Write a protein that binds this ligand. Structure first.
Ligand SMILES: CC(=O)Oc1ccc2oc(=O)sc2c1
Ligand SMILES: [Zn+2]
Ligand SMILES: [Zn+2]
Length: 568
């Protein structure tokens, strides 16, 4: 406990020797509380509306989901409330047999993931380049020799000590050191689909639907997509020990630094959290030994790894490999587990799409639906369902939720088929109406709106309202103002052809599309089912007079150069 985190706590208290105290009105139940000092609030109850896209989406002024997205509470008041929900709980220890199959599966999964690639340290030059292309963390620290502070803390890590690696709910220094030891998982694409079979790292939203359709071709039962209640809070001490096994593939200098990250920063953590008190705002210093910190490099990759392991074990239980007697058995035999992993594991990974805590799996049959002993005992309890009620799956991949989307198959006029991402339209419009940052000119606000308009033309062109609104936004913003593929000056029909035709591996016929008229929409019934306002008179009035709203935005912007992108 204190031998690992003590030095960090001593430096925090010494820096704030004035106003340091032990408040017993602290609410912490499952975290170790250490002390508090005096800062005052950072955050807001709601953020600003993007006025450009708001002026151009008037019928959605009267939509409750759009209004709610007036940002969440980042104030210390709102910060303490998120803490009560799930962060301040304890996950029960898994049973001894459960712990063993997790260890066996983790060993096999890391060896499979490391079959072609080798771990490596990441570099100051990589970290610096990443920042520039996107005790405070800015683009201003990497040009200053603050790398000597990084250098001094690394020497502590090499001795098994930690001095200043703390996260809140040098800071950039702690995150560089984590990137240095574990950044290879992301930078060398360990969870790409080719390397991990279940992963989708770097695939991109326009590919996820095609992947789901490919999974549907595998013989088996329904497709299951269970959400876990607060996944990051359900990462156990056993989970962290299993994730640590990647260090066995490292060179000793690398192993030493990654072992320091795992033991001192993941399996012992020191956290700052703001709290309101009748005297004001207060920064509390807390610590615990399990759960995952969301503000960390490698959070995504390690969550993907542990979810891959968890879903494999659930497939195991569905197929009869694991029983309740096995999960309780402290002397469980490895044989049947290893044999299943070596004969079936890769085939079973291919039945899954897994992005962090988000998973889709198509097991060999539907026994999986009621295979819940290991899933619950591992702590990955499903959200908003009785603990032992069978999972409900889908027999249409187009109904499966993944990455906050579902995916529609679209027949183009020329007969070729697209697979497009989609979500309830109010979520897309509600997000595009939110800017963040207080001191943002009309120009920066117009550029962000243009950025949303280009994403809509590239990803959501098939929704009638969004293509209209996207065209209206781009007509209202100067053509020469410029805001992953939707941040450029290229003609959006050109970018569309590159993404959906040219570089699309599921499009055999590379024949380019020459007009937006050849770019299809969802069927009208599906468009309305997914939130379209087409068919309402307030939408027809908006569409009919949209040039008026465009010209009003142009009048206020000034005498810049505008192009008309023809919105009705
Ligand atoms: C064929 C065509 O002109 O389509 C578009 C649509 C939106 C848009 O926003 C830009 O910056 S360029 C651009 C082109
Ligand atoms: Zn440290
Ligand atoms: Zn849809």
């Amino acid at each position: 406990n204190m031998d690992v985190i003590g030095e960090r706590i001593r430096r925090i208290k010494e820096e704030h020797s004035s106003t340091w105290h032990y408040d017993d009105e602290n609410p912490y139940k499952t975290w170790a509380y250490h002390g508090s000092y005096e800062v005052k609030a950072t955050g807001s109850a709601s953020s600003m509306i993007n006025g450009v896209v708001k002026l151009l989406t008037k019928p959605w002024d009267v939509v409750p989901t759009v209004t709610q997205m007036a940002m969440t509470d980042t104030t210390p008041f709102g910060q303490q409330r998120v803490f009560k929900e799930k962060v301040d709980t304890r996950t029960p220890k898994p049973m001894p047999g459960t712990r063993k199959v997790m260890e066996i599966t983790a060993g096999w999964l890391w060896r499979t993931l490391g079959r072609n690639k080798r771990p490596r340290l990441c570099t100051r030059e990589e970290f610096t380049k990443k920042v520039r292309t996107n005790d405070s963390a800015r683009a201003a620290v990497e040009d200053e020799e603050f790398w000597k502070l990084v250098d001094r803390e690394r020497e502590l890590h090499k001795q098994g000590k930690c001095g200043s690696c703390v996260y809140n709910m040098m800071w950039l220094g702690a995150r560089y050191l984590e990137f240095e030891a574990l950044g290879f998982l992301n930078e060398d694409h360990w969870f790409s689909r080719e390397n991990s079979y279940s992963g989708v790292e770097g695939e991109g939203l326009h590919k996820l639907g095609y992947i789901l359709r490919d999974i549907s071709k595998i013989p088996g039962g329904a497709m299951y997509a269970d959400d876990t209640a607060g996944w990051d809070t359900r990462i156990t001490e056993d989970d962290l020990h299993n994730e640590e096994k990647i260090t066995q593939q490292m060179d000793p200098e690398h192993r030493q630094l990654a072992n320091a990250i795992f033991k001192l920063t993941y399996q012992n953590k020191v956290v700052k959290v703001q709290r309101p008190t009748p005297k004001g705002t207060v920064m509390d210093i807390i610590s615990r030994k399990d759960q995952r910190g969301s503000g960390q490099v490698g959070t995504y990759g390690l969550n993907t790894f542990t979810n891959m392991e968890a879903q494999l074990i659930r497939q195991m239980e569905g197929e009869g490999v694991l029983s309740k007697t096995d999960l309780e058995n402290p002397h469980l035999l490895e044989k049947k587990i290893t044999q299943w992993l070596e004969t079936k594991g890769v085939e079973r990974l291919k039945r899954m799409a897994i992005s962090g805590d988000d998973c889709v799996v198509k097991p060999i049959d539907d026994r999986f639906a009621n295979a819940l002993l290991a899933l619950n005992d591992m702590g990955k309890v499903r959200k908003d369902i009785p603990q032992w009620q069978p999972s409900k799956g889908w027999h249409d991949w187009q109904q499966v939720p993944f990455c906050s989307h579902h995916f529609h198959e679209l027949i183009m006029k020329d007969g070729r088929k697209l697979v497009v991402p989609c979500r309830p339209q109010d979520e897309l419009i509600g997000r595009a109406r939110i800017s963040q940052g207080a001191g943002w000119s009309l120009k920066e606000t117009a550029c962000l709106g243009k950025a949303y308009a280009q994403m809509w033309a590239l990803m959501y062109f098939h929704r009638r309202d969004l293509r209209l609104a996207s065209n209206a936004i781009c007509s209202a913003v100067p053509v020469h103002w410029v805001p992953h593929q939707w941040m450029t000056t290229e003609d959006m029909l050109t970018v569309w052809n590159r993404v959906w035709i040219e570089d699309n591996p599921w499009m055999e016929d590379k024949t380019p599309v020459t007009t937006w008229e050849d770019v299809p929409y969802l069927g009208k019934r599906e468009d309305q089912w997914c939130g379209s306002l087409i068919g309402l008179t307030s939408r027809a009035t908006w569409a009919q007079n949209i040039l008026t709203a465009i010209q009003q935005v142009r009048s206020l912007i000034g005498n810049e150069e505008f192009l008309d992108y023809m919105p009705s």
